[PDB]
Symmetry: D2
Amino acid sequence: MDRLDFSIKLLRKVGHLLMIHWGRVDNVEKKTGFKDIVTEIDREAQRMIVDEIRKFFPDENIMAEEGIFEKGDRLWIIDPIDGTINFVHGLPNFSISLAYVENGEVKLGVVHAPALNETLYAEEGSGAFFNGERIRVSENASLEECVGSTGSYVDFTGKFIERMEKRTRRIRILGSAALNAAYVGAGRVDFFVTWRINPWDIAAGLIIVKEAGGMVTDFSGKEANAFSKNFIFSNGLIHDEVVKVVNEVVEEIG
Amino acid sequence: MDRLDFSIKLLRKVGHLLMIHWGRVDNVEKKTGFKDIVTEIDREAQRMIVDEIRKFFPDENIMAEEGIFEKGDRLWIIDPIDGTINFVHGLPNFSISLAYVENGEVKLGVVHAPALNETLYAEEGSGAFFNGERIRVSENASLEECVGSTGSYVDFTGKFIERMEKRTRRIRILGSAALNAAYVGAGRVDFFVTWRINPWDIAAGLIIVKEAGGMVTDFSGKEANAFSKNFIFSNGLIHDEVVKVVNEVVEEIG
Amino acid sequence: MDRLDFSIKLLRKVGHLLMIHWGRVDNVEKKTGFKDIVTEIDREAQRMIVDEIRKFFPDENIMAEEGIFEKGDRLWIIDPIDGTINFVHGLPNFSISLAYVENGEVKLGVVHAPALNETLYAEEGSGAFFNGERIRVSENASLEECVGSTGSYVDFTGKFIERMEKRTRRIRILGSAALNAAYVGAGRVDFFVTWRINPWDIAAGLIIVKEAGGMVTDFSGKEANAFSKNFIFSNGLIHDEVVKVVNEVVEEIG
Amino acid sequence: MDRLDFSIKLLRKVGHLLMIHWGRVDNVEKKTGFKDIVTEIDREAQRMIVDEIRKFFPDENIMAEEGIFEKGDRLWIIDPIDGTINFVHGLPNFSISLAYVENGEVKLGVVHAPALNETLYAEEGSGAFFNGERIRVSENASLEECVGSTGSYVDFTGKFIERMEKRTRRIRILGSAALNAAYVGAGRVDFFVTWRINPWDIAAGLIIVKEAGGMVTDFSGKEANAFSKNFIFSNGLIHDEVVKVVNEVVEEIG
């Protein structure tokens, strides 16, 4: 609809800005932390997205990973570049994420991968889409036929792949959280695990997976909410299995 | 050129055949286990390539992942679909690989990813390209500032990440050995490690990374060629450090 | 919904088949008569579509296999290739279209240009889209500021341009009616005129233009349908003026 | 090589800048000087191209399209947007052209269509390419088997279509002189006719057609050079037939 179409068009527009500097970034500093990085393109992409929202939705709030941090019953969650590292290195797996939350709940989410021309999205009650076509989670009911995936987390990823690679086809590490979550919704992977990360980071992939028919919970199997920190996105069919094994990795890591 | 131009065009043509079935493969068969598959599309794609080569180079030899394993002074090495599992699940990381080997040494190599429209290639003595433009390995001299990558091998993977994770920036597991290797010569990743592997998964990757200024040796450090069972591709500035961790991991196993 | 999604996916799939031969037709065929090979591609593309419609909509008339009824019937129109000349010569302006018609009314239409990665479409009542995002006809209400289009038709084209020449900004001849019609609903051109063509070749574009807010009438100015004898697609703002010149041109000729 | 690889990469980079605004000069900012916003995109793009050239080839002349008429040994001819009308309307047929001239002769040429991902180029003595593969002029020997092209020129286009229509297979009017001339070297069109356009805006195309084995002369039939005003690009198999037909049009005019 209105807000959704606006988002798709907006992220595709800004997506071209990132394409100009893709792989050719000069200023790269380690943002809030030490593991990840951030660039001047990050903020410039955010500024472009933020100016447009404020333009058509003046009385509404915004919340970026770095910079703007507001709260309201009409809130936009922006992540100018998810997979900054990939972006900087020239890997195509990076995306722009945008979610619209109203009255505390996610009403719609969009994830756009400039270099892959992949715009995945969904608005609650309307299903999940991918560049115009409907997407649904997979029907792979057992791990022997599943391709899972996870993020790069110290002490977690290695031991997680350690235990999982044995019971699945493959485990992928792509480098863009939002996209990977949307991929479960697209049905390209059967599950996606992401440890100790910011909750607002995946508001867009969450609604996409849920509208795609998937299941999203914390490492406890409990419905994923704004107070969860670890997330598990799946096709709902092999969730229990993934959850069990995830606690087996978190335990082993003390 | 003649053989290079021929190879680029042939792979691009066959790539469309694969696009038709991408993510919509009805039946997949387990070659040796559930982690090792192949499809009838692999076969149809190879046949298209084989038939074309036979037509213009009738007396030359052809060697493929399956079906044809000829030997000779003039040999063409084929991998119809490098990343079959990704291909079946609908992930974009899969490619067609071709290489012309003359007297044991690979003269030209072409790696084509249909979903991503990425054709990387190199001819002996002519440099490495990416869809017409020149590519060269990264200039990252420190492992900390590197993004390495590897395949999904049971036991070795979990261990490799485990070790490498505290030494690098990120480690990726995309799914296509040929592409993953060519990605090194593209400067998208700083190194790539392969455990247990055939010539058709890396003949094209060696020449690309080599003509792109990088290094390719077995796990011991010996400059390998057609095969060696173990491979390490890199920009050459951190090859030793990677070989160090690799031997650690492999010994930590045994 | 069900039909529209079915159609978007089916065409995006079959379009890849056309991409195999696209411009790959050797001159031995273009010289002897590319009519044959083109028909083999046409036949094969139609076969794949027909086979699928049979599986999902078993009791619906496909391309008049069960007659031609301007009222009281359910029909599926298939155009495997529109812009055949462009296709043969290697021009990217060619497409594949599918349209479902009920009682002479186009309920939904899809135009897919494989080489441009453009999927335009519309369902009756839901508006027109372009790869997931909404499209609408332009708002240029003065012929002198419009970009028009027509086909390379004998007699008609030379004159149509003579006229339009000073009355309008630019006139384009793309060589792809369906794509061209759709481009009107996308607001890329302000009006498109067709001289002596198969109505079923632009039925998909018909619904696309109307749902995008424009209008489509025959030369006599009557709203057009899938059986009309002539076509004029516009943004609905300068439609009367084009009909005028069109008829003037028709007078001059025959 | 150095200059050609730098140009290919440079045009591909700036191309995304154009994409950000492609078809994005809507009515809300169309009623607020849109021919000015397109001049900002142009100047901004021109600025990027100019800066990079100066940064790598410092003491070399730069005759930007909307720049100055410098003179010297080494000269770079730039055109930020060729096909401005299409660009403004959302049509994909627009390009960025760059030609490098030394000693008065064009040494290399690049034509990049951002919206189509088409990079056509050639180096004197190295032939023509299209995203890495070799391209060559068509092999059509008679006009009745050719698809010709020209632009939209008042008093000329009409008559041209008139006289050409009954001698040729089909004529096209796409809207981008450089892209269109390049398409002759790619073999998509058998010939192209421009009417009173500055040689500079067509220099990149000229080297592409010639390295592709084509023919480019002025309306008289003599080699095309800076003293030319009207051009004819062809495969060299039907050049004379075209010159003959074009001259008849020229007669009908005045």
